[PDB]
Amino acid sequence: SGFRKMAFPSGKVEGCMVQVTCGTTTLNGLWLDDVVYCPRHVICTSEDMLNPNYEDLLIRKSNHNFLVQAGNVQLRVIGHSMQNCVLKLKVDTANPKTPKYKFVRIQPGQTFSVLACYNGSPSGVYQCAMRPNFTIKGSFLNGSCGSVGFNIDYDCVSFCYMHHMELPTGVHAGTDLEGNFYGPFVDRQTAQAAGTDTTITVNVLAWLYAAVINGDRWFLNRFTTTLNDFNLVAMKYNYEPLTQDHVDILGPLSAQTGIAVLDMCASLKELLQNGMNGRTILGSALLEDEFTPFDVVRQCSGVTFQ
Amino acid sequence: SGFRKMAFPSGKVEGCMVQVTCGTTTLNGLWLDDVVYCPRHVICTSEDMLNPNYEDLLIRKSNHNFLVQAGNVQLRVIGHSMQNCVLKLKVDTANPKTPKYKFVRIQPGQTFSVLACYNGSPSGVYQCAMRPNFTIKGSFLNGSCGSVGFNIDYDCVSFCYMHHMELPTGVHAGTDLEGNFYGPFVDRQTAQAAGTDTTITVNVLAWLYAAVINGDRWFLNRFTTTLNDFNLVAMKYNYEPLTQDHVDILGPLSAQTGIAVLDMCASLKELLQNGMNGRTILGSALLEDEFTPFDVVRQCSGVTFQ
Ligand SMILES: *[C@H](O)[C@H](C[C@@H]1CCNC1=O)NC(=O)[C@@H]1[C@@H]2[C@H](CN1C(=O)OCc1ccccc1)C2(C)C
Ligand SMILES: *[C@H](O)[C@H](C[C@@H]1CCNC1=O)NC(=O)[C@@H]1[C@@H]2[C@H](CN1C(=O)OCc1ccccc1)C2(C)C
Incomplete structure (x- = not known):
């Protein structure tokens, strides 16, 4: 007996975590097969971050601008594209640790495990619910973007969340793995606020x-x-x-x-x-x-x- | 910002978890190098479990009585010995996923992550504290014995806990990885109770x-x-x-x-x-x-x- 807030074992996700650096911004990416997924605001600079045009910003980028590191090993970026609010970086190596996975979008009221990461290195694992207002009450510091939320079903990892930002009340907002935000939020610095829960x-x-x-x-x-x-x-x-x-x-x-x-x-x-x-x-x-x-x-x- | 009860990433420990079956008892073992560690009460039967003599019980055992399975692969037991309340099963294969590790004993007031396991398969991960009365408020069902508690320090796993039993108040008791119980408990069915916290x-x-x-x-x-x-x-x-x-x-x-x-x-x-x-x-x-x-x-x- 006993009842504890319990996360899924994180090992299958730990093997997918990498570091993505572009210019002065470092964050986490999710490496599955030969694609690294990360928040598109990695292409930003602090003066880009108030009202950016991401298509404009991305066309000015080169493959070699993206530094991807899996542990102590550099991954060569060979292509890039934007999908909604995430970037897909095509790299020259398929992740040999890729688990069977799905990209699912969850409902408010549903729970998932978050693997908090910094510099591509997993830091901690904990359980979150999607609030009715599409925020999550997480624990995220600078550099945690690109950390993912997930559930595991037998051997299959259903990724449901990628972290992008913190709202003024200290709650957190992000996207599904197709880059579509949960809730009425944008990866822009505005006056956006959570909304009643x-x-x-x-x-x-x-x-x-x-x-x-x-x-x-x-x-x-x-x-x-x-x-x-x-x-x-x-x-x-x-x-x-x-x-x-x-x-x-x-x-x-x-x-x-x-x-x-x-x-x-x-x-x-x-x-x-x-x-x-x-x-x-x-x-x-x-x-x-x-x-x-x-x-x-x-x-x-x-x-x-x- | 945010503050959550956070466990360590469990991947390094997941790679050490195996299933140990002897007679009618199935529980978890911890596979490090060529040794599997598990609670010694795996050698028991339900009529052994009221007042057992474990040295007597162990001398009557044979290597082949111990069925050890790492995933879907059987590990041949080639030796066995008792260390306090744990068994050390020497197997013919060193775990290629053995992390750098230590066996540490923690103090009441200290915390650690528990990787709950059943049939050698990790189920969930959560954070526990060692209570002042040497119990932990965990979440453990039948078959969870041999699940371990741990901390991670850079790349090194400090194992501090192996689960053995539930006390009548629904709290949990176990040993360090040298087999020495936390608190005044025995791996016997008695009237033992937690004691004031x-x-x-x-x-x-x-x-x-x-x-x-x-x-x-x-x-x-x-x-x-x-x-x-x-x-x-x-x-x-x-x-x-x-x-x-x-x-x-x-x-x-x-x-x-x-x-x-x-x-x-x-x-x-x-x-x-x-x-x-x-x-x-x-x-x-x-x-x-x-x-x-x-x-x-x-x-x-x-x-x-x-
Ligand atoms: C990505 O690592 C970072 C994660 C934030 C940092 C603090 N807590 C988090 O969850 N995301 C951002 O910094 C996003 C990014 C820029 C603004 N932003 C953001 O979260 O602003 C609020 C904030 C920032 C720093 C400290 C507290 C609160 C954009 C593109 C939305
Ligand atoms: C090992 O898998 C099991 C773990 C217990 C089972 C229920 N919750 C747990 O944490 N350990 C035991 O069954 C130990 C073992 C036998 C008695 N025992 C025990 O925990 O008894 C209390 C109990 C048992 C079943 C259900 C609720 C409470 C000995 C050798 C101490």
């Missing part, structure tokens, strides 16, 4: 089920509620509405605990209206919303990846 | 400094306190005493924020006596004690590992 209701319920599975039961009650009456209380506390599909997705966790989804909703209602009154749930004094029903089932069952 | 005071202060670095300042005050007067309040709330060495270790974080250690202690005092009053610190409604001053400096600066 909400709490991921289905995830809170999944985490409550994780708590029950692990022996935290004090918040359970005999009450119940209708989906409609629960959703009235949801909005009120700035929680996302709960759909019948969410109820369906929680079925397995309901069947394992013997607690009907709607009964767990009644528990959540009381927690929202009363607080926790000095008590904790899975070591937290807050209702946690960054675990999906999948994350709970995986960890409270023990799936692996080879 | 305390909060790691120096770590709470480090996390407060992490908060300030990231723009949470509401808990700061103009008051100060003496080390002695702070430690009176510490005990009271079941916090560990703060030593002058702890104050010294917090010096760099004090110098970066401009907040004297003793002033941050005065802030902690008020948080202990008043609570947080609906507010959060780094997304937590509790005072977090599983980040060391090192962890804060690493993440709020950006060290990597190659």
Whole structure:
């Protein structure tokens, strides 16, 4: 037993991380087969970075301007192109450590592992959720751009995120691996700001089920509620509405605990209206919303990846 | 910016994980050079497990009783010996992925990354602290024994933990890689229980400094306190005493924020006596004690590992 915010093993991604330097900018790239993917703002200079025209900037570039280093070994760039907000640098060597991978775009409410990197060297790994406002609450310093987020499904790495920037509230914004931003953000220095967030209701319920599975039961009650009456209380506390599909997705966790989804909703209602009154749930004094029903089932069952 | 519970990249450890099966017991082993390390209770059967004599049990074993699988490849066991509570299985192949490593034993209050594994396959990675009572609050199911905890220092993996068992409160106990248990526990089914824990005071202060670095300042005050007067309040709330060495270790974080250690202690005092009053610190409604001053400096600066 036990319940921890758990990332996927990072090894398959570590073998893809490289350093990309152009002019005075150094950041990370993702090396898959013979292509290195990196944020296109690597072509910028600090006076380019306020209102750049990236096509203009890229046509003035040469292959040899891009210094790509995989560990202590230089990769020769033999072609370059822009795809939305990422650059694809064609190099003369296919990465022999390329895992089976996909490029997927995730939904708000979904989680993934981030491999924080600097100078092409992995620094740390942690779990993030895509917020309803398309930001992520990460940990990113200068030089971390090009770090990727991912999930692993058996032996296959589904890359879903590349880091590009920090917003003024200290949250983070980036793209999918096709270079399309999550949310209404641009790789421009503007006055852009995150925008109002909400709490991921289905995830809170999944985490409550994780708590029950692990022996935290004090918040359970005999009450119940209708989906409609629960959703009235949801909005009120700035929680996302709960759909019948969410109820369906929680079925397995309901069947394992013997607690009907709607009964767990009644528990959540009381927690929202009363607080926790000095008590904790899975070591937290807050209702946690960054675990999906999948994350709970995986960890409270023990799936692996080879 | 941002602050997240961050594990080390797990790749170097993933390459060492194997499956060890003996009789009806399957667990994980750690394969370094030509030795596989695993918990000695792999030699047990469910009727052995109440009060076993492990030397007796081991002399009745044969090399061929131990099935070791590294991925889909069987490793021939050519020797075996017991070292305290771990088994060393000598195999006919040195692990070509053996990283530079050390076997270190950590102190309570210190943190490390756990690579949860099942059937020799890594499942997830997360950060744990050694509690003052020598348990860890992990996430471990049946089959997870032999998963290891570690830190990485440049390119060197310092293994500090091997998982053996869960205690009745749902916390976890294990050994260093020399097979010596952390804390007063035995790999026997008895009525053993964790024992009273305390909060790691120096770590709470480090996390407060992490908060300030990231723009949470509401808990700061103009008051100060003496080390002695702070430690009176510490005990009271079941916090560990703060030593002058702890104050010294917090010096760099004090110098970066401009907040004297003793002033941050005065802030902690008020948080202990008043609570947080609906507010959060780094997304937590509790005072977090599983980040060391090192962890804060690493993440709020950006060290990597190659
Ligand atoms: C790429 O390594 C960097 C990552 C930032 C740096 C601080 N935290 C991060 O996540 N990305 C950027 O610097 C982007 C880039 C330039 C502005 N920018 C950005 O994040 O601005 C906000 C910021 C910068 C530095 C420190 C705090 C906040 C453009 C092209 C958007
Ligand atoms: C090894 O894979 C297993 C890991 C346990 C299983 C549940 N959570 C864990 O961390 N270790 C054991 O089963 C050890 C082993 C036998 C008893 N034991 C143990 O942990 O007992 C408590 C327990 C067991 C199963 C489920 C919940 C709690 C001995 C030799 C100590």
